[PDB]
DNA sequence: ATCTGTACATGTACAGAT
DNA sequence: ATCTGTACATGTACAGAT
DNA sequence: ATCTGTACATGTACAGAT
DNA sequence: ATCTGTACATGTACAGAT
């Protein structure tokens, strides 16, 4: 049942083998441009980010997500106001005493359409721009569509800003050295604005590629020698359950995977043992991510793991009602089997 | 009993007055030999220090009089030749190294013999503190420094080559801890340098002294520091569990015995080191630890032990095909005294745990 | 004036002390 | 139970060099 | 600075075994 | 039905060379 939808969910190695040839011919080049020319971005470094690099992709290998980051010494930051993930920056970037996070992609995102204007063996345009929005998103076709989301980033090197002391909560899950040891790697900024236009956003990505691949209480977990978990599978599941009420109802726009994704991290936290996420308890392990949600939307409640005090489900973020519209389609996916899954 | 072996390992505890007090010294002293050989002629200049072994590990006994630390030296354009298939030993072919080059061939105890050279120049500079270079001991890389700041306190300094290629051939199927801290941790701890250590032992054999030894020193200190399988083994939101604490209870049946019969001499720490990473191999899961098992735990160490003894067998845990009781290293008279000896105390309520 | 090997500054796991 | 000294990893300042 | 070579993690695919 | 062993594929760390 559950395992057959994971059936359909699974890529097929030779649609992973021919979309990432392509996507790796287009970002080397937008690489080497930020390089070779001589731009403001000369040292930006690639870091590959979210599902396929972290191999909770479902469906198809279509969306891929890159960063360039871009050390920057002395960058003194400062809270806007309150909000926890959302700071300004303050001392080549001459031209953009604040770092304007507008400035700073509108020139990155000029750079790649220039580039992007000189690829003559791939079918490959860049989307129009979503404003507020830290990427720059390329629509590529072989045949089939792949988006790939270039993402500018800052890359600081000091300890993390103070909202993030009390986040991370894996002490006893992966324990204290890991979390000491991954509060050593930098931290990360991303011209995502606020509602304005000089704001930036953590952005932890790196650190949650590591959890993905190093998620359980024991070292074997998933590998050759230890025990498979069913640990991604139900963050796979409860991807597609969103995926495909997203499909339908417009009154979802305000959700996305990155919601899912905080769920199953705090769904991890509370139960570290992967004994408690046994394949053969895969419905149950499902069920209880389902309940979980569920109380999320009820309280209006999904604190942001790395940050808080950063509540992704407060009115501000999500309308009171549009929570309770995705409580109503996923209770009744709920009571009746999933019949979504089937469509 | 679950309560003999607490008290026990209550007198075995370190106290920090005494480790405050002897790091102080040894750190001191140590500082001051780095800085020499980083000064202008050295051979050794680069060469970065690495601590190593019982006390940087947490499972030292007793007190804190004996410090091990490596002072290394990478080397780029490095040609290994193993030596008679032994897994273990090697020589070294290819620059501040020159006058120790023998037409290719990198001497160890050429070099060792400059190393140790300086280090005596150096300790003789020293006015703050009662230092001597211990008498070299054959079959020993080592420097050894016997500090009498009061308490009598020995420093080996242990010189080594560094290399960062792969590991040779002979560790391919050692380190076997897939079951246990996983194949992930594998990977990265192979991913980390080797060394090569003086072998610099008198037998009078070929070769003699132009043959180095691999050392895993600091693969060990992470395994005995990272030993669940579980991350948060031992750590302030996980479990405790009995691993070092039965270390420590072996190490200390060995030098008790070893103080009393020098019938024992073959015999040394890193033997029961090897023996309990077999069991940690054996036994990989946390609650295989549990510290109200103590007893059993230990006991079943010791059983491991008397079987390595009675067959003559225990492998090198990095080196599999190194056999570490052989008989070309050790007597069968000398494992039947010390099987005769452990058998007894496991039989008789550890007397010697008394003394 | 700028560069850089050396060592201070900061943070916390481990484990003894109280 | 909390308090605390050592070891250790990484970031960063600057006297002396260039 | 840039880039290849190596090793092995993470995956999918499928036949034979269970 | 699931498990197991081999073959096939991409992603990622880092040594060494240029
Ligand atoms: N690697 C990385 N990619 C990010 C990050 N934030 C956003 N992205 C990428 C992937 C996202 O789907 C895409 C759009 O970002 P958001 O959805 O946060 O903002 P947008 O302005 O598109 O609107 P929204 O808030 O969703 O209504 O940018 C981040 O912190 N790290
Ligand atoms: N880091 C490191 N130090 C080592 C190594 N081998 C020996 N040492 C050092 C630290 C020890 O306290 C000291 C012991 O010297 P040896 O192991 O050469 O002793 P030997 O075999 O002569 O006699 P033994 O078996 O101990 O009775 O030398 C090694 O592989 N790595
Ligand atoms: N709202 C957000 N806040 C913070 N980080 C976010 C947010 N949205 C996305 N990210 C980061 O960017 C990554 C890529 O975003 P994206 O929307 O592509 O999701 P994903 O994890 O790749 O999953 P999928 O593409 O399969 O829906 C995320 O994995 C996360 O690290
Ligand atoms: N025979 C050996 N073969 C390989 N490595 C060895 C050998 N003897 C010692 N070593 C290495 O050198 C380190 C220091 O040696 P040493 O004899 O001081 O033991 P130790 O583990 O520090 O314990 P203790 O000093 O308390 O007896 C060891 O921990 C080990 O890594
Ligand atoms: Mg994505
Ligand atoms: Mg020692
Ligand atoms: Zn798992
Ligand atoms: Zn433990």
Redesign the interface.
């Known amino acids: 049942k559950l395992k057959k939808v994971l059936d359909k969910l699974r890529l097929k190695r030779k649609d992973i083998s021919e979309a990432a040839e392509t996507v790796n011919k287009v970002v080397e080049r937008l690489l080497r441009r930020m390089q070779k020319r001589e731009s403001e971005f000369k040292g930006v470094e690639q870091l590959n980010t979210g599902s396929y690099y972290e191999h909770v992709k479902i469906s198809a290998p279509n969306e891929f997500d890159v960063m360039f980051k871009l050390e920057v010494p002395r960058i003194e930051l400062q809270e806007y106001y309150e909000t926890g993930a959302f700071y300004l920056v303050k001392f080549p970037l001459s031209h953009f005493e604040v770092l304007s996070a507008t400035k700073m992609l509108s020139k990155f995102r000029k750079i790649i359409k220039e580039e992007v204007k000189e690829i003559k063996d791939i079918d490959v345009s860049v989307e129009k721009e979503k404003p507020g929005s830290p990427a720059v998103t390329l629509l590529i076709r072989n045949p089939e569509e792949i988006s790939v989301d270039i993402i500018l980033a800052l890359e600081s090197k000091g300890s993390w800003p103070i909202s993030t002391k009390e986040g991370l909560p894996i ?8 979390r000491t040891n991954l509060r050593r790697e930098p931290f990360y900024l991303v011209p995502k604005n606020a509602k304005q236009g000089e704001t930036w956003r953590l952005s932890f990505s790196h650190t949650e590629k590591y959890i993905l691949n ?1 998620h359980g ?4 977990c998933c ?4 025990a498979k978990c069913c640990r991604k599978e139900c963050l796979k599941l409860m991807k597609y359950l969103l995926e495909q009420l997203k499909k339908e109802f417009q009154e979802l726009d305000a959700f996305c995977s990155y919601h899912v994704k905080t769920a199953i991290f705090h769904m991890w936290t509370q139960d570290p043992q992967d004994s408690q996420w046994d394949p053969r308890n895969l419905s149950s392990c499902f069920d209880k991510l389902l309940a979980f949600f569920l109380e999320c939307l009820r309280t209006e409640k999904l604190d942001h793991y790395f940050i808080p005090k950063f509540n992704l489900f407060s009115q501000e973020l999500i309308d009171r009602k549009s929570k309770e519209f995705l409580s109503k389609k996923i209770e009744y996916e709920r009571n009746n089997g999933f019949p979504i899954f089937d469509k």
Do not use: P, R
Request: hydrophobic fraction near 25%.
């Open positions: 002490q006893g899950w992966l324990g204290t050295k890991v190093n209480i024991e070292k074997t590998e050759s020698s230890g």
